[PDB]
Amino acid sequence: LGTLPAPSVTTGIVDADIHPVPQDGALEPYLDDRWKKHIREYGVRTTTGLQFISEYPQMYGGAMPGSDRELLRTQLLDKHNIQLGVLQCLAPGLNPAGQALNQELAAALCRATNDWQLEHLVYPDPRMRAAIPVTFETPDYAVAEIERVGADPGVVAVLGTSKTLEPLGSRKYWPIYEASVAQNLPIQFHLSQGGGHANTGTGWTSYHTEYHTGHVQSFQSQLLSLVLSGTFDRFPTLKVMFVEGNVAHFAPLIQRMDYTWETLRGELPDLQRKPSEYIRDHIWASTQPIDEPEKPEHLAELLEEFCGDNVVFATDYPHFDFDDPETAFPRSFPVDLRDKILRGNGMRFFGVTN
Amino acid sequence: LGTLPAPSVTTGIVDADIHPVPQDGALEPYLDDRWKKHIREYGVRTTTGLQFISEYPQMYGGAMPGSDRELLRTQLLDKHNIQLGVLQCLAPGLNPAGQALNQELAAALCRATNDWQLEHLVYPDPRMRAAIPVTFETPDYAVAEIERVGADPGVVAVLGTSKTLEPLGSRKYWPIYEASVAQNLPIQFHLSQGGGHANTGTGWTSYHTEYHTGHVQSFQSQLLSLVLSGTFDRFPTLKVMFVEGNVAHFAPLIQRMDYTWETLRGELPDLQRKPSEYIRDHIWASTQPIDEPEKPEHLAELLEEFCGDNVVFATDYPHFDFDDPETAFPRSFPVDLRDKILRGNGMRFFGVTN
Amino acid sequence: DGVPAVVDCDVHAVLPSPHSLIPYLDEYWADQLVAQLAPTYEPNYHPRGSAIAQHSDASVDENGRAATTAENLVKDVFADGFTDFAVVNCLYGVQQIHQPRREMAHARALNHWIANEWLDKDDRLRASIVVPQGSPRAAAEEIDFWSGDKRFVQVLLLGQSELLYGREINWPIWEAAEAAGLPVTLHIGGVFRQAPTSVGWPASHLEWYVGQQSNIEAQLNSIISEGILQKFPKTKILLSELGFNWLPPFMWKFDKLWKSYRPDIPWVQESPLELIREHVRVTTSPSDGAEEAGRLDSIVDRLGSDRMLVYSSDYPHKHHSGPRDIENGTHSPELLDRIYRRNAFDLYNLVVPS
Amino acid sequence: DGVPAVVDCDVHAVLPSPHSLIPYLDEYWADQLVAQLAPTYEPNYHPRGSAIAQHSDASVDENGRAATTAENLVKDVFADGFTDFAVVNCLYGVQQIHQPRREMAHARALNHWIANEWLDKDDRLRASIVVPQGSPRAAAEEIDFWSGDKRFVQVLLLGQSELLYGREINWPIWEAAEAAGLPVTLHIGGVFRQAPTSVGWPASHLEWYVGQQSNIEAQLNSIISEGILQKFPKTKILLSELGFNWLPPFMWKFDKLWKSYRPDIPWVQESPLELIREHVRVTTSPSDGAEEAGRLDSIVDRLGSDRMLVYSSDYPHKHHSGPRDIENGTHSPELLDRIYRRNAFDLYNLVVPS
Ligand SMILES: [Fe+3]
Ligand SMILES: [Fe+3]
Ligand SMILES: [Fe+3]
Ligand SMILES: [Fe+3]
Ligand SMILES: [Zn+2]
Ligand SMILES: [Zn+2]
């Protein structure tokens, strides 16, 4: 690695969610041989009884400088004037690194991935920056990794998963937030599987409609926890973003939260503010996959009802449901709202100076 | 509190599990009014949807100085020459204090209980000592409580529950072990409910036979975790005892463990010893409810097969299935084994000098 | 013909004590109950001391409790003459009895208590059939059993179940409800046999209560995706005390993913948008902010149907907003007439008596 | 009459790939599978690279894998002439397909692959019926379907299920097995729809593998307590690759608690001690230390019956001890004759052919 400038966004856009198309032995020069042998013998054991796949496969997933950079440069970065593209590598290669039941292996794989995306994508083309995967279920290792590479300017955020063993407001994770706030880093939680419980609070889903729609639910529960535990009283500078868990649903969820709090606030007397008052400074959300109301004017209504300043654009390239910054919004969409979704809102979240 | 001597056991016996029959307002002089009001409004929320009871009631539970001391003195301590009676108060009053989903409440209730059993039972009759309940699911609070009262000579152990959110070998609990080893305290894990998962690894039990027999299973899983995580490599002085999770089953479980390890040890290369080799210095177990083989000579066989030095007597007074130090063993039982179950084995576990 | 009546679609009878079921139990279960020390399955859905438990204005019994007698309930619910009928839901926690035969017996006893002590005492009262959710075939027999008593107007289920209600093992309930001509309602509350969220246990009653909307999204997706509405085309679903403002973003996403995945659930040939609009109804208390100026008009608009909301007071629970405050959120007398009379007529067929 | 044959009660066919099921699928499911990028449900019960996966001595295919063809399996299993029949279990993870109709279709295809590619190729082979565990009524139909082919000799279930196998929703399997005259086996492996232990997720394959004996205690208690043996009195159960040395302490405790709780399960009038001895059989590989001097005699003695153990090699898995090393643990030729021939005759009725 040489040296990098802080990210810059002027007339291009922010893209919060990009999944770098990796390569096979790519991680092997960053893994010690202990874990090479261990992976050769056991794979990456997770919250399944499956040797290779996750509990909910995709049902059609697959298509198509050097490695994979030129395609990313020309298909995505050049094509869409992306000045800040945040890389979110959850699979070595499709289960999250941090979710490996062997947590020492998981931290080795997290380490290998961070060294790899930095050297191979960010530093060669610093329009891309990394959200570094860490082992959220072993805070000690995650703190160590945030300290190892978090201060590098190639790193713009800490990367977690929507599904966890305890809700993200639980004290188990406060050391990770404390380390993040020390590195001046925000945290992104990506839609994921696993985590240790069923994919809903009331059983496992059957068909692909329940599975993929169900992903918003984990996010609904993580917002409630993070807010009503007082996590944002303890860490008043912490910014978190929910990624690929759509946006519009958060608005009626927060609306219900305040409504119930008006009656039951006595249960949580240390909570310093009204619950919806924490959204502005602490909770962002990315757009992909965009919400598609029957009447398209409802989209801008609900995004503003969540918070118009805290919604950030993402492509989710190269997934099948990827969003295009042109096509994704309806044509009556307010121009000022769209512009700050593309530029300003992400700029504030990631800390890039105007 | 005045001052106390270290416990002394000469010709009497050790009783590892005694449940002090508490009183209603007893904890109120040790609870701040915040939690008084909070308990008045919400009870003690736990891993159920039940306002008062636990998910598996007893189906016949109930019977019958000052408060409750004289009955304990004369019915139990005097009657059985008990020189070291370890108090294990899991209910304020029957769900464990530490298991309260409001963990701040749970630490307040743990605090209130520790101050109460110390002042009300131990110091008035120091034949009784306390195993102090802590909040195992919030290590920070549990460390704080081990440091607040753990050095008091009225305290002989740290008290936990058989059911936990993660297996006890998980790093989540290592700060608690580190604090315990610093206070020169062993840890007792009592049979419990709750913990956050079903009462077996494959669903919830239906009838009372499955429920009460099923309690050994949680212990089987906690032994495997505690040993195969290398927890006893990291804390080579740590002693833990499984309480009211019978004894005999541990022997074939450990036997299977070594057998499987002979083939799959490669998965865990940092593990310093053969798995059964950790039993001697780290794993004890209490006797109640005594195992009752069809051929009574199998009892001594299996206790020795677990480890003859690590089995400790307990009455579980005043529960219905309580054991009598006379009646509990069969008459062919080897006299030397019985004597150290009554005296020496517990003496070593609790650190009372010969 | 005739004018559809104003039906209060959700009010509660509070069982004074488990003792109240003894008259309706067989001698076997009566002995079990008396021998068990009569453990109460009073739920924690509305903690008896919390602000949501009861109104300050409510009629109470000698122990300060609201809604434990029909006399107290009728005196409050009907006092102003606006309501013609109230649908009674008793949420006593028989669904949390783990012993399957005891769950059967207490559920039948609870229904007997409702018939004789509530429905018999006032002909303006109706009720739902509490069912033993743990054994669907037995729940179907409990529905058949009461199908002959037209005062029982719907089938009661909890928002959180053991397996999602679309799973085939749950079809006997849907079939039996359809053959009895009864809507199935889902009321907030759960069996608590997994963590109430896909990311673990919520730490406060407040957090649990707001978040239960997530489980209802999972249930509606399970019910529709698995084919319940094609298999049982006359099924009606009522969501009781579960909010409604979360519905539109859920419906939009579900419809988006149904189009992307139609071959995976070929039995689903109508749009989930339309199925939900035609088959799902929702009570109005709590209103969760829909009572503010224009917000009722906005939500109906986003819902895409004025036939979904049915009036309820949720007596005797206290909410930030009162049973008739929804009028401040609409300017359309026609909409208010559908919420008070016309929509509930689709569920119960109750015309104003004389 | 005739001499009962030496039956190897547990050997494995390894599905080479999900592609191998395409010939047996309907065009609907074949398209789904081809479109899905053919995700493989190869389990992690025996990680393909781990030491337990296969013997060094084993016949392999062009990819180094053992037991993917009948030709390789027959060549090893029967090479020395000692075995007359082998019962084939394919553990390909169709039970972990969450889509219930796809689970049905792949289970039937797997059984078709077994019949045509294994049972057809050699008449010394038998198999179990893989069943769609997620829909018990469909699993009963899968049993009915193959009941006409006497080469299928037992019903395959995993040690870990979604709900315990005594629960009423699972009775269609017990009924169908009984009507087909087939024993039900439980083989190590799980659906992984809750944590594999009551205290959470085990961190290594080793820890998971040893601990699965705990789930089998929960299953045997569920099956007996709920009345399966009274309801289906001819039921036979085989425990496959699950150890046996844990049985006696479990049986003693279960019997103790049955006596203390007989009115709670009145259908259980025989002692669980006797029921287990009469209805449960257990394969001998792994032996878990029973192969050491005297240990086979000791365990039979503790078991209280010489009719429970049946011979198995567990081909092609590697265990610390070999299929016939159990002879070093007994001095009784009569016992060895029951383990090799007489006990399995209770399951399959296989006499030595000519
Ligand atoms: Fe993404
Ligand atoms: Fe994506
Ligand atoms: Fe006890
Ligand atoms: Fe006890
Ligand atoms: Zn209600
Ligand atoms: Zn096997």
Author numbering:
A (entry chain B), B (entry chain B): 9 to 72, 83 to 111, 115 to 375
C (entry chain A), D (entry chain A): 27 to 380
What's written in the study?
AibH1H2, a non-heme diiron enzyme, acts as the terminal oxygenase in the three-component monooxygenase system to produce α-methyl-d-serine (D-MeSer). All previously reported amino acid hydroxylases that form hydroxy groups on an aliphatic C–H bond belong to the Fe(II)/α-ketoglutarate-dependent dioxygenase (2OGDO) superfamily, but AibH1H2 belongs to the amidohydrolase superfamily (AHS). Thus, AibH1 and H2 are α′ and α subunits forming an α2α′2 heterotetrameric complex that act as the hydroxylase component in the Aib monooxygenase.
The AibH1 and AibH2 subunits interact via 36 hydrogen bonds and numerous van der Waals interactions. The structures of AibH1 and AibH2 align well displaying a root-mean-square deviation of 1.75 Å for 294 residues, despite the overall amino acid identity of just 28%. In the binuclear iron cluster containing oxygen bridges, the distances between Fe–O and Fe–Fe are 2.1/2.3 Å and 3.3 Å, respectively, and the Fe–O–Fe angle is 95°. AibH1 contains one Zn ion coordinated by side-chains of two histidine and three carboxylate residues (Asp24H1, His26H1, His201H1, Glu255H1, and Asp328H1). Thus, the AibH1H2 heterotetrameric complex contains two catalytic AibH2 subunits, each with a diiron center, and two AibH1 subunits, each containing a zinc ion. Although the amino acid sequence identity between AibH2 and Streptomyces platensis PtmU3 is only 25%, the residues needed to bind the Fe ions are highly conserved. The Glu313 of PtmU3 coordinates to an Fe ion, while the corresponding residue (Asp342) in AibH2 does not directly bind to, but indirectly interacts with, an Fe ion via a hydrogen bond network with water molecules replaced by ethylene glycol in the crystal structure.
